[PDB]
């Protein structure tokens, strides 16, 4: 009879096959990633192409059911998911070409290596080769060699391709009536038609910039402090009023400044909270690390891990008899099947990473209660923020002492409080200007506010002005230094790292109140608050069934992202940096460079 009848018929049939095809695909993908063979590549390709085929066909047939005529909102939301997605209006000739550019760019990223000017035929890759240098090297010219070689040998091969990427990507974005592809990406945060919870694409830029401006005072003092310290470790090479050289920031691009901790540590004479040696003295293994994460989630009232998680998961590296992809990854295969893949080492880092990865499992498990197409995080920043807050509580001295990785007589003091906040800021606050700047550059290129003959000109201006970070060597339009980062060459949004950063502190403040924490926020462990897990579960559970603005509001009592919680976390450090930097220069010449 009715059209909303035919729609439910249509969905019930799509969901049945999709639940099966999605699993046959995620299962093959898991096999490959755990055991890299030609046959597993083949199954994964074959199973990839069936789902894609299915989801294309279905998406088209979904248009027969226009949302206006659909009164049921669950059914509407599902039909919308399907109608929107599974759609490439880009012609099959060009799609083919773009699919190649993506592959070539991805290959060049993993494959490319810099063979040493000196060396006959010793060739470093980015991983682990150049990355070992760019983290651990304390030699200016060695870091500068790796930094430049990478950009001038690999980046210059990406420039031809990334120019063509922008053309085909912008065609694709405009065939869907989006202004440009940056606009499409901003569409992940778009709520339209939910009275009271709506959010537009241009609003994202507005809040990212407004929030960023409130963060500038803190990064300015972080930058001033770090620079004053890098003058001691690299005397002669850094101006006291200039940008930080790009090759001195503790990794290949300066995304994180984490590796500068040893150079910039406020009070080195104090103990380092690191518990890797207690983990080893107590003979912890991967099982233990993951059984301790499981206990953390049970303490807030979330479920245990499934039987199948312990049977099907790979929690350690399987040796030389088997080739696994050792990037920590949480999996939601479907049909009640959840697995983590991780080459766990008996380390504090992996301990905390385990909590991050199992947090995604709890998220995926929660929203299994949702219909298939609504089984996703509320926005590209939610899953990462869910990960990060688990790690925030587990890293605290309170929790480590509770699990016995820290002696009951550890002396957490003001200095101990400041060292922690500094190391945290070097990782969290340090990536905020780098993340904002990078996506800004990309937004602008996609928009057309940047001509190809100024791409690198604008990149380094923008780096200097926003990030306070100058190239050590002049780079022409033969370079594509943006694409020298994984996500740029591999076609992925980067604003998710900015949004997830505010979200995560917004979530922690709310869960720490729900848990009724006394002191400063950085010393908060939601470990035994069922009220904290209750509040959290009610958002996890929604998946993508509600607007991200209501999802967020459930947890935090506000409908947009907000920087007060993040700034309240680093307040003690912020007031410490200001007292420290009072005989140093705060601010940067955007013109001083090391090649001046």
């Amino acid at each position: 009879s009715t059209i909303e009848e035919q729609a439910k018929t249509f969905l019930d049939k799509f969901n049945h096959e999709a639940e099966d095809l999605f699993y046959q695909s995620s299962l093959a993908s898991w096999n490959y990633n755990t055991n890299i063979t030609e046959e597993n590549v083949q199954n994964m390709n074959n199973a990839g192409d069936k789902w894609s085929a299915f989801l294309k066909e279905q998406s088209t047939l979904a248009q027969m059911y226009p949302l206006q005529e659909i009164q049921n909102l669950t059914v509407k939301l599902q039909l919308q998911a399907l109608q929107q997605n599974g759609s490439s209006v880009l012609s099959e000739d060009k799609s083919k070409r773009l699919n190649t550019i993506l592959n070539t760019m991805s290959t060049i990223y993993s494959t490319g290596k810099v063979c040493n000017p000196d060396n006959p035929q010793e060739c470093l890759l980015l991983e682990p080769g150049l990355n070992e240098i760019m983290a651990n090297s304390l030699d200016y010219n060695e870091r500068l060699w790796a930094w430049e070689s990478w950009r001038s040998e690999v980046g210059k091969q990406l420039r031809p391709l990334y120019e063509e990427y922008v053309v085909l990507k912008n065609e694709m974005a405009r065939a869907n009536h989006y202004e440009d592809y940056g606009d499409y990406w901003r569409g992940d945060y778009e709520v339209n038609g939910v009275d009271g919870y709506d959010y537009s694409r241009g609003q994202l830029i507005e809040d990212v910039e407004h929030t960023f401006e409130e963060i500038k005072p803190l990064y300015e003092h972080l930058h001033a402090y770090v620079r004053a310290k890098l003058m001691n470790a690299y005397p002669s090479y850094i101006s006291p009023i200039g940008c930080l050289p790009a090759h001195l920031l503790g990794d290949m691009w300066g995304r994180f400044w984490t590796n500068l901790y040893s150079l910039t540590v406020p009070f080195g004479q104090k103990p380092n909270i690191d518990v890797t040696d207690a983990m080893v003295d107590q003979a912890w293994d991967a099982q233990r690390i993951f059984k301790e994460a499981e206990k953390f989630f049970v303490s807030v009232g979330l479920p245990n891990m499934t039987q199948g998680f312990w049977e099907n998961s790979m929690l350690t590296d399987p040796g030389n008899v088997q080739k696994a992809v050792c990037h920590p990854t949480a999996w939601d295969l479907g049909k009640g099947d959840f697995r983590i893949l991780m080459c766990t080492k008996v380390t504090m880092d992996d301990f905390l990473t385990a909590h991050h990865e199992m947090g995604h499992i709890q998220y995926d498990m929660a929203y299994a209660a949702q219909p298939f197409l609504l089984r996703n995080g509320a926005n590209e920043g939610f899953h990462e923020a869910v990960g990060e807050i688990m790690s925030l509580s587990a890293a605290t001295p309170k929790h480590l002492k509770s699990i016995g990785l820290l002696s009951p007589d550890f002396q957490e003091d003001n200095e101990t409080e400041i060292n922690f906040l500094l190391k945290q800021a070097l990782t969290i606050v340090g990536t905020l200007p780098f993340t904002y700047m990078l996506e800004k550059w990309r937004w602008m290129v996609f928009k057309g506010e940047i001509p190809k003959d100024q791409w690198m000109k604008k990149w380094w201006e923008m780096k200097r002005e926003i990030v306070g970070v100058v190239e050590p060597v002049p780079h022409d339009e033969t370079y594509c230094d943006p694409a020298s980062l994984f996500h740029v060459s591999n076609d992925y949004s980067f604003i998710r790292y900015y949004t997830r950063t505010l979200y995560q502190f917004q979530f922690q403040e709310a869960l720490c109140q729900a848990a009724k924490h006394e002191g400063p926020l950085h010393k908060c462990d939601i470990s035994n608050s069922t009220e904290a897990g209750q509040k959290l579960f009610n958002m996890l559970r929604l998946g993508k069934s509600e607007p991200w603005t209501l999802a967020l509001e459930n947890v935090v009592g506000a409908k947009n992202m907000n920087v007060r919680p993040l700034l309240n976390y680093f307040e003690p450090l912020f007031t410490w940096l200001k007292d420290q930097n009072k005989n140093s220069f705060v601010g940067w010449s955007t013109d001083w460079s090391p090649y001046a």
Partner: peptide
């Protein structure tokens, strides 16, 4: 862009298809 993600990570375009 999506519909249903099976693994939390951003895998390289070459081998995730």
């Amino acid at each position: 862009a999506c519909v249903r993600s099976h693994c939390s990570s951003l895998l390289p375009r070459i081998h995730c298809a």
